[PDB]
Write a protein that holds these residues in place. Structure first.
Motif, PDB file in Angstrom:
ATOM      1  N   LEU A   9       0.837  -1.201   0.000  1.00 38.13           N
ATOM      2  CA  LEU A   9       0.000   0.000   0.000  1.00 38.13           C
ATOM      3  C   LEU A   9       0.876   1.257   0.000  1.00 38.13           C
ATOM      4  O   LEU A   9       0.624   2.187  -0.744  1.00 38.13           O
ATOM      5  CB  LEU A   9      -0.951   0.007   1.197  1.00 38.13           C
ATOM      6  CG  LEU A   9      -1.962   1.154   1.353  1.00 38.13           C
ATOM      7  CD1 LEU A   9      -2.837   1.313   0.123  1.00 38.13           C
ATOM      8  CD2 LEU A   9      -2.829   0.951   2.606  1.00 38.13           C
ATOM      9  N   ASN A  10       1.916   1.267   0.824  1.00 39.25           N
ATOM     10  CA  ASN A  10       2.826   2.412   0.864  1.00 39.25           C
ATOM     11  C   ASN A  10       3.526   2.597  -0.470  1.00 39.25           C
ATOM     12  O   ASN A  10       3.804   3.710  -0.887  1.00 39.25           O
ATOM     13  CB  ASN A  10       3.852   2.261   1.998  1.00 39.25           C
ATOM     14  CG  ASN A  10       3.230   2.476   3.364  1.00 39.25           C
ATOM     15  OD1 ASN A  10       2.220   3.171   3.492  1.00 39.25           O
ATOM     16  ND2 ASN A  10       3.826   1.884   4.389  1.00 39.25           N
ATOM     17  N   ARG A  11       3.812   1.482  -1.127  1.00 40.38           N
ATOM     18  CA  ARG A  11       4.360   1.503  -2.476  1.00 40.38           C
ATOM     19  C   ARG A  11       3.439   2.256  -3.433  1.00 40.38           C
ATOM     20  O   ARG A  11       3.890   3.109  -4.157  1.00 40.38           O
ATOM     21  CB  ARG A  11       4.620   0.087  -2.984  1.00 40.38           C
ATOM     22  CG  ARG A  11       5.482   0.047  -4.228  1.00 40.38           C
ATOM     23  CD  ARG A  11       6.904   0.486  -3.950  1.00 40.38           C
ATOM     24  NE  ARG A  11       7.719   0.382  -5.163  1.00 40.38           N
ATOM     25  CZ  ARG A  11       8.509   1.346  -5.633  1.00 40.38           C
ATOM     26  NH1 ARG A  11       8.615   2.506  -4.994  1.00 40.38           N
ATOM     27  NH2 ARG A  11       9.201   1.148  -6.747  1.00 40.38           N
ATOM     28  N   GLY A  57       3.200  16.580 -10.973  1.00 42.67           N
ATOM     29  CA  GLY A  57       2.990  17.983 -10.694  1.00 42.67           C
ATOM     30  C   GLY A  57       1.832  18.140  -9.722  1.00 42.67           C
ATOM     31  O   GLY A  57       0.980  19.018  -9.872  1.00 42.67           O
ATOM     32  N   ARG A  58       1.785  17.241  -8.744  1.00 47.85           N
ATOM     33  CA  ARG A  58       1.042  17.478  -7.518  1.00 47.85           C
ATOM     34  C   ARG A  58       1.943  16.786  -6.509  1.00 47.85           C
ATOM     35  O   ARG A  58       2.615  17.434  -5.728  1.00 47.85           O
ATOM     36  CB  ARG A  58      -0.415  17.038  -7.623  1.00 47.85           C
ATOM     37  CG  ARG A  58      -1.358  17.915  -6.807  1.00 47.85           C
ATOM     38  CD  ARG A  58      -2.818  17.526  -7.007  1.00 47.85           C
ATOM     39  NE  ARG A  58      -3.275  16.607  -5.974  1.00 47.85           N
ATOM     40  CZ  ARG A  58      -4.409  15.917  -6.040  1.00 47.85           C
ATOM     41  NH1 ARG A  58      -5.209  16.029  -7.099  1.00 47.85           N
ATOM     42  NH2 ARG A  58      -4.746  15.105  -5.051  1.00 47.85           N
ATOM     43  N   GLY A  59       1.971  15.462  -6.536  1.00 48.23           N
ATOM     44  CA  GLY A  59       2.703  14.712  -5.532  1.00 48.23           C
ATOM     45  C   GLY A  59       1.819  13.624  -4.958  1.00 48.23           C
ATOM     46  O   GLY A  59       0.642  13.556  -5.276  1.00 48.23           O
ATOM     47  N   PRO A  60       2.391  12.766  -4.104  1.00 51.49           N
ATOM     48  CA  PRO A  60       1.662  11.664  -3.486  1.00 51.49           C
ATOM     49  C   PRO A  60       0.371  12.129  -2.822  1.00 51.49           C
ATOM     50  O   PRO A  60       0.317  13.208  -2.223  1.00 51.49           O
ATOM     51  CB  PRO A  60       2.647  11.164  -2.437  1.00 51.49           C
ATOM     52  CG  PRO A  60       3.968  11.420  -3.072  1.00 51.49           C
ATOM     53  CD  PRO A  60       3.824  12.729  -3.776  1.00 51.49           C
ATOM     54  N   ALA A  67      -7.662  -0.492  -4.156  1.00 52.32           N
ATOM     55  CA  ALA A  67      -7.235  -0.801  -5.522  1.00 52.32           C
ATOM     56  C   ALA A  67      -7.960   0.091  -6.516  1.00 52.32           C
ATOM     57  O   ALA A  67      -7.345   0.611  -7.435  1.00 52.32           O
ATOM     58  CB  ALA A  67      -7.453  -2.284  -5.863  1.00 52.32           C
ATOM     59  N   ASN A  68      -9.268   0.271  -6.341  1.00 52.00           N
ATOM     60  CA  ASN A  68     -10.010   1.108  -7.271  1.00 52.00           C
ATOM     61  C   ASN A  68      -9.473   2.532  -7.271  1.00 52.00           C
ATOM     62  O   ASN A  68      -9.290   3.134  -8.330  1.00 52.00           O
ATOM     63  CB  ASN A  68     -11.515   1.085  -6.985  1.00 52.00           C
ATOM     64  CG  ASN A  68     -12.180  -0.203  -7.465  1.00 52.00           C
ATOM     65  OD1 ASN A  68     -11.622  -0.949  -8.286  1.00 52.00           O
ATOM     66  ND2 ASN A  68     -13.384  -0.463  -6.964  1.00 52.00           N
ATOM     67  N   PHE A  69      -9.189   3.051  -6.085  1.00 53.75           N
ATOM     68  CA  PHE A  69      -8.672   4.400  -5.983  1.00 53.75           C
ATOM     69  C   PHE A  69      -7.363   4.546  -6.761  1.00 53.75           C
ATOM     70  O   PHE A  69      -7.170   5.534  -7.460  1.00 53.75           O
ATOM     71  CB  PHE A  69      -8.447   4.825  -4.528  1.00 53.75           C
ATOM     72  CG  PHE A  69      -7.803   6.176  -4.409  1.00 53.75           C
ATOM     73  CD1 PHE A  69      -8.562   7.334  -4.532  1.00 53.75           C
ATOM     74  CD2 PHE A  69      -6.433   6.292  -4.232  1.00 53.75           C
ATOM     75  CE1 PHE A  69      -7.964   8.593  -4.445  1.00 53.75           C
ATOM     76  CE2 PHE A  69      -5.829   7.539  -4.144  1.00 53.75           C
ATOM     77  CZ  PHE A  69      -6.597   8.691  -4.255  1.00 53.75           C
ATOM     78  N   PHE A  70      -6.460   3.576  -6.609  1.00 50.25           N
ATOM     79  CA  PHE A  70      -5.170   3.616  -7.308  1.00 50.25           C
ATOM     80  C   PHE A  70      -5.245   3.089  -8.757  1.00 50.25           C
ATOM     81  O   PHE A  70      -4.244   2.999  -9.452  1.00 50.25           O
ATOM     82  CB  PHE A  70      -4.093   2.882  -6.480  1.00 50.25           C
ATOM     83  CG  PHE A  70      -3.697   3.625  -5.216  1.00 50.25           C
ATOM     84  CD1 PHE A  70      -3.003   4.832  -5.297  1.00 50.25           C
ATOM     85  CD2 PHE A  70      -4.036   3.141  -3.964  1.00 50.25           C
ATOM     86  CE1 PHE A  70      -2.645   5.521  -4.157  1.00 50.25           C
ATOM     87  CE2 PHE A  70      -3.663   3.825  -2.816  1.00 50.25           C
ATOM     88  CZ  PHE A  70      -2.969   5.014  -2.913  1.00 50.25           C
TER      89      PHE A  70
END
Length: 93
Positions: A7-9, A18-21, A63-66
């Motif tokens: 998940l942290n990965r 051009g925003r970030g994590p 998962a859906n979010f990513f």
């Protein structure tokens, strides 16, 4: 590789260029926008390894979010190849 590391990965490799994590908070808000409830404390527990063995529904929501299949969390072969593709798409973005 544990769920928390995976998940942290995703936090470290799937985000708007051009925003970030994303912050944990943004994820909770994005889930909420889709009818999915997840507490801030639980997301922190998942990321910190304090709670392991998330449910199917939880892994699916994250998962859906990513925009990835949850098999990323559960299938070693798949995780390793996809992580590499995501890293590459990250530099491409």
């Amino acid at each position: 590789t544990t769920f928390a590391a995976r998940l942290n990965r995703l936090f470290d490799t799937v985000y708007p260029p051009g925003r970030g994590p994303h912050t944990s908070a943004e994820v909770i808000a994005a889930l909420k926008a889709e009818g999915i409830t997840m507490s801030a404390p639980y997301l922190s527990q998942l990321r910190s390894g304090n709670r392991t063995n998330p449910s199917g529904a939880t892994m699916a929501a994250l998962a859906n979010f990513f925009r990835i299949k949850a098999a990323y969390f559960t299938d070693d072969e798949y995780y390793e190849k996809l992580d590499k593709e995501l890293q590459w798409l990250c530099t491409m973005r």
